[PDB]
Enzyme design. Structure first.
Site, PDB file in Angstrom:
ATOM      1  N   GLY A 215     -15.591  31.274 -91.551  1.00 49.11           N
ATOM      2  CA  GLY A 215     -14.275  30.944 -90.982  1.00 49.11           C
ATOM      3  C   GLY A 215     -14.204  31.010 -89.456  1.00 49.11           C
ATOM      4  O   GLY A 215     -15.185  31.356 -88.774  1.00 49.11           O
TER       5      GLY A 215
ATOM      6  N   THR B 191      -1.941  34.444 -87.021  1.00 51.50           N
ATOM      7  CA  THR B 191      -1.546  33.023 -87.185  1.00 51.50           C
ATOM      8  C   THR B 191      -0.816  32.722 -88.505  1.00 51.50           C
ATOM      9  O   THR B 191      -0.374  31.591 -88.741  1.00 51.50           O
ATOM     10  CB  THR B 191      -2.766  32.059 -87.000  1.00 51.50           C
ATOM     11  OG1 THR B 191      -3.908  32.540 -87.724  1.00 51.50           O
ATOM     12  CG2 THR B 191      -3.154  31.935 -85.521  1.00 51.50           C
TER      13      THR B 191
ATOM     14  N   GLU C 157     -30.505  54.573 -92.556  1.00 54.19           N
ATOM     15  CA  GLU C 157     -30.537  56.018 -92.574  1.00 54.19           C
ATOM     16  C   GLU C 157     -29.176  56.622 -92.165  1.00 54.19           C
ATOM     17  O   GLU C 157     -28.774  57.652 -92.727  1.00 54.19           O
ATOM     18  CB  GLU C 157     -31.722  56.503 -91.709  1.00 54.19           C
ATOM     19  CG  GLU C 157     -32.043  57.986 -91.808  1.00 54.19           C
ATOM     20  CD  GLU C 157     -33.232  58.371 -90.955  1.00 54.19           C
ATOM     21  OE1 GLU C 157     -34.340  57.845 -91.209  1.00 54.19           O
ATOM     22  OE2 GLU C 157     -33.050  59.192 -90.023  1.00 54.19           O
TER      23      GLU C 157
HETATM   24  N1  LIG Z   1     -11.144  38.904 -83.089  1.00 52.39           N
HETATM   25  C1  LIG Z   1     -10.932  37.606 -83.454  1.00 52.39           C
HETATM   26  N2  LIG Z   1     -10.027  37.338 -84.416  1.00 52.39           N
HETATM   27  C2  LIG Z   1      -9.774  36.055 -84.780  1.00 52.39           C
HETATM   28  C3  LIG Z   1     -10.488  34.964 -84.141  1.00 52.39           C
HETATM   29  N3  LIG Z   1     -10.059  33.831 -84.721  1.00 52.39           N
HETATM   30  C4  LIG Z   1      -9.120  34.147 -85.643  1.00 52.39           C
HETATM   31  N4  LIG Z   1      -8.978  35.480 -85.683  1.00 52.39           N
HETATM   32  C5  LIG Z   1      -8.086  36.243 -86.561  1.00 52.39           C
HETATM   33  O1  LIG Z   1      -8.327  35.867 -87.931  1.00 52.39           O
HETATM   34  C6  LIG Z   1      -7.067  35.606 -88.595  1.00 52.39           C
HETATM   35  C7  LIG Z   1      -6.917  34.119 -88.887  1.00 52.39           C
HETATM   36  O2  LIG Z   1      -8.010  33.664 -89.677  1.00 52.39           O
HETATM   37  P1  LIG Z   1      -9.086  32.571 -89.173  1.00 52.39           P
HETATM   38  O3  LIG Z   1     -10.415  33.274 -89.155  1.00 52.39           O
HETATM   39  O4  LIG Z   1      -8.617  31.831 -87.975  1.00 52.39           O
HETATM   40  O5  LIG Z   1      -8.901  31.664 -90.462  1.00 52.39           O
HETATM   41  P2  LIG Z   1     -10.027  30.935 -91.322  1.00 52.39           P
HETATM   42  O6  LIG Z   1     -10.937  31.922 -91.942  1.00 52.39           O
HETATM   43  O7  LIG Z   1     -10.540  29.882 -90.412  1.00 52.39           O
HETATM   44  O8  LIG Z   1      -9.130  30.386 -92.547  1.00 52.39           O
HETATM   45  P3  LIG Z   1      -8.368  28.954 -92.659  1.00 52.39           P
HETATM   46  O9  LIG Z   1      -8.364  28.353 -91.290  1.00 52.39           O
HETATM   47  O10 LIG Z   1      -7.082  29.331 -93.319  1.00 52.39           O
HETATM   48  O11 LIG Z   1      -9.199  28.096 -93.608  1.00 52.39           O
HETATM   49  C8  LIG Z   1      -5.989  36.096 -87.625  1.00 52.39           C
HETATM   50  O12 LIG Z   1      -5.796  37.508 -87.862  1.00 52.39           O
HETATM   51  C9  LIG Z   1      -6.654  35.842 -86.284  1.00 52.39           C
HETATM   52  O13 LIG Z   1      -6.173  36.587 -85.185  1.00 52.39           O
HETATM   53  C10 LIG Z   1     -11.480  35.324 -83.102  1.00 52.39           C
HETATM   54  O14 LIG Z   1     -12.161  34.444 -82.498  1.00 52.39           O
HETATM   55  N5  LIG Z   1     -11.624  36.622 -82.832  1.00 52.39           N
END
Ligand SMILES: Nc1nc2c(ncn2[C@@H]2O[C@H](COP(=O)(O)OP(=O)(O)OP(=O)(O)O)[C@@H](O)[C@H]2O)c(=O)[nH]1
Ligand SMILES: Nc1nc2c(ncn2[C@@H]2O[C@H](COP(=O)(O)OP(=O)(O)OP(=O)(O)O)[C@@H](O)[C@H]2O)c(=O)[nH]1
Ligand SMILES: [Ca+2]
Ligand SMILES: [Mg+2]
Ligand SMILES: [Mg+2]
Lengths: 67, 440, 421
Positions: free
Chosen positions: B10, B179, B254
């Site tokens: 993701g 988001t 470990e």
């Molecule tokens: N630390 C961090 N968190 C992220 C990032 N991108 C998204 N998030 C967090 O992950 C969540 C959103 O999920 P994403 O990983 O964007 O979603 P996805 O897995 O792509 O899922 P879909 O787009 O619904 O198919 C939110 O809590 C975001 O703030 C990143 O680059 N860094």
């Protein structure tokens, strides 16, 4: 002692296979139940829309049989 | 040998992957084309960095890594960007339609279309390994793919690889960068589904990282890029034991022995120091004692919770750079007669220590100062359960009204998967309470 | 590429549609010929959402233009950007519906629907990955109202796993006198509640009151009303059109905004009609709503706020936190973190900064109650009913539409009165 050692390693293989087995089966029941539910949710929506065409046929019918 | 395969799932998994792998390349002197001048053994080798990189006949060092997203736009950035020559096209897998912030779509509707292809690409990495140790999975809790696809993938890896270890880096949601309203749902469903499939899971609370960036690095409004650079520093500290060797190096496995007293109790708290701007590091050296002390400051944790109000079951210190045992032991002895460190009565109180001599690196244009010494503490505390209590409370508020539940049911899920996932979380919160009670 | 298929139906539909395409074509830097003569790479990055590419670097709206009246079709074609729409994508009858929903839904509209589907299908099959559909229409007329709602039902049968989005113009005695409009609107609502995923309520009442009371225009033209509609519509589609994080596609927007499938009617807001604190204060103001409902008369289930322009993100974050803190009673406490914020860099045309608001508020009941009162003052007298029975409709169908719309009201009231404890 040698027989005990044989039993321990067999237990370990058995439990690892049981875990693989049971994970394979729970996943397959989940993917099946889900496919069915999704399908029934769509079939129901399509049926509701089918009943709208049947009602629209019947309304146009009701118009023409009036002069 | 001892190979590790990384799976980035993701947007969050993938973008964190970029940051980690860029940093690994700088740590080992690997160029963006995969060439590593200092590596004299062409096309193979059994060096420490070979746990993470394989080698082609042409001298290319290739991440043992798969990137997977259900949508193409984040992975397309890896494909056209700085490190695009690093990865063979088959390691970067994309669908067309994402999971739309819905676990059901990531796990079933959309994810079932791509899961066989992903496991085939993983199989191809595994087949190149002479002694595969296991997997590191990177994903958010909140996303549809990060939650639903990861949970599907973990289940399938348990089938295909048996008890081969699986470690997670899991992005716990925060209101400042989140988001979706439904992130609490997605978080509980994935946590329940993967709990039996995972050996060890490092939760990274986006709010803890956002706070550290704002407070320690003077970033007004941190972006993913800010958060990810810091996360990669923490991931790097954890994997450093696998990727380097040295006399006082102590293998991650470990530490794990000490960190997981019961299979469900597998969520260590990470704390990292020092996090400091170039402006403030100038002329100010942080000593071993200073950085070790900073580990017991809650503002430095990767998850917001208070260890002063729970109990310890383990404590591990992973040092990197210019650090000798004498100084570590002195710093530890000071902290012990000065801090709020209470262990459960059933585990011994000694800290476990590893030192890698290779000092931290920073990425060009980043925010962190280049320091001579750094530390990551990994502790097993009952306080981590606070993070669960917060998410479970959010889940309960919405679930009592069935708010948004129709989006999951529409995709084929039943309400019974919700209450079942929630009950497992209640039982987990209970488990954490029970381990902190004194013995009879 | 996540394609949206645009449909405009009827006079209102077509008028607001053309305005929509003018504003967004300007913003994405494309000609009335269909050429790119912009400056920023960000304008083209997600062009595919609304535009097909024909070679010669020509961009063609994925737009379908529908009316039973042949007139307005000439109006679009002779309009600015009339050159841009695909000739084949125009679908006209000649028997205008004469403000009769039944004529639109059951009869004349049903005769034309099949050749509309032909064009929809043609546009849809060319799509890499179709998100779904947006319909611009009014609910007061006969074509937009009846045939628009028939098109919805028909599209839904062939694309049941796609998102159906509407921009629906709600009638007001301040703008049109056509007396049968409460009937047309109620029959429309009955359809929209069952068959769309998301509906932007564009209230003619509210658009009047902004022109008269705030903008101070003594009698406003449809052109003044529509300036508001197009600025709103530009706002709410920003997240679809420019690279970005939040609500970037129609499904993700629906999942954030729709906690219960029937409660999918949104009040949009706009500002200005500036400093970050003022924009924030203004977009939450009753006087800035495109629906004639006071937010302070209900509770917010969910909110999306979109800031456009160069500004401090730090300040937007603080101001959004500030507004929730001070107005906490007006957000339901049992949906945590229910207000989301996107900031896009590109301002709209002529503004340095703007704010667009999308609210799912239980205060929308006030709009449905207005329509229900005007409907009930006709129906208990059986007034003008012969226009409808004249096409084959039963009295039962009127009773059902009304009591479903009443059901929707009490449902919005149910979630207004609900507590965490
Ligand atoms: N630390 C961090 N968190 C992220 C990032 N991108 C998204 N998030 C967090 O992950 C969540 C959103 O999920 P994403 O990983 O964007 O979603 P996805 O897995 O792509 O899922 P879909 O787009 O619904 O198919 C939110 O809590 C975001 O703030 C990143 O680059 N860094
Ligand atoms: N805001 C706005 N409202 C409009 C406009 N044109 C018409 N309306 C409203 O639309 C409703 C009437 O619907 P129309 O679109 O004119 O009717 P139609 O869909 O073309 O149907 P027929 O003319 O009966 O074939 C009334 O409430 C008008 O006030 C417009 O350009 N802007
Ligand atoms: Ca080598
Ligand atoms: Mg995504
Ligand atoms: Mg007309």
């Amino acid at each position: 002692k040698r027989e005990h050692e044989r039993e321990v390693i067999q237990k370990a293989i058995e439990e690892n296979n049981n875990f693989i087995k049971m994970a394979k089966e729970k996943l397959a029941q989940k993917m099946e139940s889900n496919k069915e539910n999704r399908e029934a949710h769509l079939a129901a929506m399509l049926e509701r829309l089918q009943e709208k065409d049947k009602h629209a046929e019947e309304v146009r019918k009701n118009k023409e049989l009036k002069e | 040998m001892r190979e590790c395969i990384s799976i980035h799932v993701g947007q969050a998994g993938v973008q964190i992957g970029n940051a980690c792998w860029e940093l690994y390349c700088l740590e080992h002197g690997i160029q963006p084309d995969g060439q590593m001048p200092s590596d004299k053994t062409i096309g193979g080798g059994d060096d420490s960095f070979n746990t993470f990189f394989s080698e082609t006949g042409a001298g290319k060092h290739v991440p043992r890594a798969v990137f997977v997203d259900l949508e193409p736009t984040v992975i397309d950035e890896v494909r056209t960007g700085t490190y695009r020559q690093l990865f063979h096209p088959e390691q970067l897998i994309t669908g067309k339609e994402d999971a739309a912030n819905n676990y059901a779509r990531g796990h079933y509707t959309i994810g079932k279309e791509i899961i066989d292809l992903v496991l085939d690409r993983i199989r191809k990495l595994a087949d190149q390994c002479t002694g595969l140790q296991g997997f590191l999975v990177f994903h958010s809790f909140g996303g549809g793919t990060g939650s639903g696809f990861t949970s599907l993938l973990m289940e399938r890896l348990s089938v295909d690889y048996g008890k081969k270890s699986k470690l997670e880096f899991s992005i716990y949601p925060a209101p400042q960068v989140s988001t979706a309203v439904v992130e609490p749902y997605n978080s509980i469903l994935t946590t329940h589904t993967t709990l039996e499939h995972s050996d060890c899971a490092f939760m990274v609370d986006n709010e803890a990282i956002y706070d550290i960036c704002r407070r320690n690095l003077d970033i007004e409004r941190p972006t993913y890029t800010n958060l990810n650079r810091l996360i990669s520093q923490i991931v790097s500290s954890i994997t450093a034991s696998l990727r380097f060797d040295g006399a006082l190096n102590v293998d991650l496995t470990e530490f794990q022995t000490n960190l997981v007293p019961y299979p469900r109790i597998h969520f260590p708290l990470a704390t990292y120091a020092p996090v400091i701007s170039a402006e403030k590091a100038y002329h100010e050296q942080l000593s071993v004692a200073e950085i070790t002390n900073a580990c017991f400051e809650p503002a430095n944790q990767m998850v917001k919770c208070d260890p002063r109000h729970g109990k310890y079951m383990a404590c591990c210190l992973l040092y990197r750079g210019d650090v000798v045992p004498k100084d570590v032991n002195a710093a530890i002895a000071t902290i012990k007669t000065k801090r709020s460190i209470q262990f459960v009565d059933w585990c011994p109180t000694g800290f476990k220590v590893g030192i890698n001599y290779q000092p931290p690196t920073v990425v060009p244009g980043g925010d962190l100062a280049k320091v001579q010494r750094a530390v990551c503490m990994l502790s097993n505390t009952t306080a981590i359960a606070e993070a669960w209590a917060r998410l479970d409370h959010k889940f309960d508020l919405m679930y009592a009204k069935r708010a948004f539940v129709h989006w999951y049911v529409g995709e084929g899920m039943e309400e019974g998967e919700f209450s079942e996932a929630r009950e497992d979380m209640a039982a987990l919160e209970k488990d954490y309470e029970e381990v902190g009670v004194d013995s009879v | 590429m996540r394609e949206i298929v645009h449909i405009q139906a009827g006079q209102c539909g077509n008028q607001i549609g053309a305005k929509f395409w003018e504003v967004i074509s300007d913003e994405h830097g494309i000609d009335p010929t269909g050429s790119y003569h912009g400056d920023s790479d960000l304008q083209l990055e997600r062009i595919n959402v609304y535009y097909n590419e024909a070679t010669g670097n020509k961009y063609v709206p994925r737009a379908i233009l529908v009316d039973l009246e042949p007139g307005t079709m000439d109006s679009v074609r002779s309009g600015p950007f009339g050159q841009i729409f695909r000739p084949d994508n125009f679908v006209f009858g000649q028997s205008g519906a004469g403000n009769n929903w039944a004529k639109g839904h059951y009869t004349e509209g049903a005769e034309l629907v099949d050749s509309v589907l032909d064009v929809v299908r043609k546009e849809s099959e060319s799509c890499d990955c179709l998100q779904g559909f947006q319909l611009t229409h009014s609910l007061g007329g006969g074509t937009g109202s009846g045939m628009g709602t028939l098109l919805i039902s028909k599209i839904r049968e062939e694309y049941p796993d796609r998102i159906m989005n509407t921009f629906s113009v709600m009638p007001s005695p301040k703008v049109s006198d056509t007396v049968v409009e409460p009937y047309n609107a109620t029959l429309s609502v009955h359809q929209l509640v069952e068959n769309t995923d998301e509906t932007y309520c564009i209230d003619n009442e509210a658009l009047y009151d902004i022109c008269f009371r705030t903008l101070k225009l003594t009698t406003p033209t449809y052109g003044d009303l529509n300036h508001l509609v197009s600025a709103t519509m530009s706002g709410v589609t920003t997240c679809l059109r420019f690279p970005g994080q939040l609500n970037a596609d129609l499904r993700k927007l629906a999942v954030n905004m729709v906690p219960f499938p029937r409660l999918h009617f949104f009040m949009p807001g706009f500002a200005p009609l500036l400093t970050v604190p003022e924009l924030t204060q203004q977009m939450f103001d009753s006087k800035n709503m495109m629906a004639a409902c006071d937010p302070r008369h209900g509770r917010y289930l969910t909110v999306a706020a979109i800031f456009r322009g160069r500004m401090s993100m730090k300040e937007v974050d603080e101001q959004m936190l500030n507004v929730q803190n001070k107005n906490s009673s007006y957000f339901v406490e049992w949906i945590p973190n229910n207000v989301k914020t996107a900031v896009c860099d590109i301002p709209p045309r002529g503004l340095k900064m703007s704010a667009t608001f999308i609210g799912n508020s239980t205060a929308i009941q006030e709009l449905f109650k207005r329509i229900s009162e005007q409907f009930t003052a006709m129906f208990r007298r059986k007034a003008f009913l012969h226009w409808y029975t004249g096409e084959g409709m039963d009295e039962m169908e009127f009773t059902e539409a009304e009591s479903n719309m009443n059901d929707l009201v009490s449902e919005y009231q149910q979630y207004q009165d609900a507590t965490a404890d």
